[PDB]
Amino acid sequence: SGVFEVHNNCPYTVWAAATPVGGGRRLERGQSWWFWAPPGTKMARIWGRTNCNFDGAGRGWCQTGDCGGVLECKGWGKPPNTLAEYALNQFSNLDFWDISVIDGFNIPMSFGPTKPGPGKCHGIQCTANINGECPGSLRVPGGCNNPCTTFGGQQYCCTQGPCGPTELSRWFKQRCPDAYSYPQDDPTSTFTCTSWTTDYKVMFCPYG
């Protein structure tokens, strides 16, 4: 319960990050990072940072997902960064989790329970070649930004009230049907498992 394995299967190095628990860890291909989240942990995210350069003290910078120039993240990363989000022991004894591209996409990833269950408690992924097919307007080095990051505004960010899918969010949704494509993409993007029944695993580049 509450245990996360973050495994890197990408050809390149990935500096894993996680908040509010976890921190960060350099992961060469084949390596795993294990951390535990106390029961009740909410608004948590796990992500990978690419093309980093750190000194001996842990200060540096990353091309994507940079969390304030430090290796062990205390805060969120700079988009674009594919996200695995979770909240344990929420209402009705359920863990709520998802993969999100609301803050862009940088690395393909899978996210799922170690002990599956009925309903939505099964593994999901977002492994489409988003970086290679990314629209020119959203394209950045090593990633593909969500229109809310690139353009801003209610239409894409939904800060002013109800919003719906846009041509750009749909572009993401077509490639990753199980991931959050825009702020209010809730019905087809939320997955759950009964609390205290399973651990979780995140993999960067499942297919290599």
Swiss-Prot record:
GO terms for biological process: defense response. Keywords: Disulfide bond, Glycoprotein, Pathogenesis-related protein, Plant defense, Signal. Induction: By tobacco mosaic virus infection and wounding. It comes from the Eukaryota. The keyword Glycoprotein applies. The keyword Membrane does not apply. Disulfide bonds join C10-C205, C52-C62, C67-C73, C121-C193, C126-C176, C134-C144, C148-C157, C158-C163. Belongs to the thaumatin family. This is Osmotin-like protein. The lineage of its organism: Eukaryota, Viridiplantae, Streptophyta, Embryophyta, Tracheophyta. The chain holds residues 22 to 229 of 251 of the full protein.
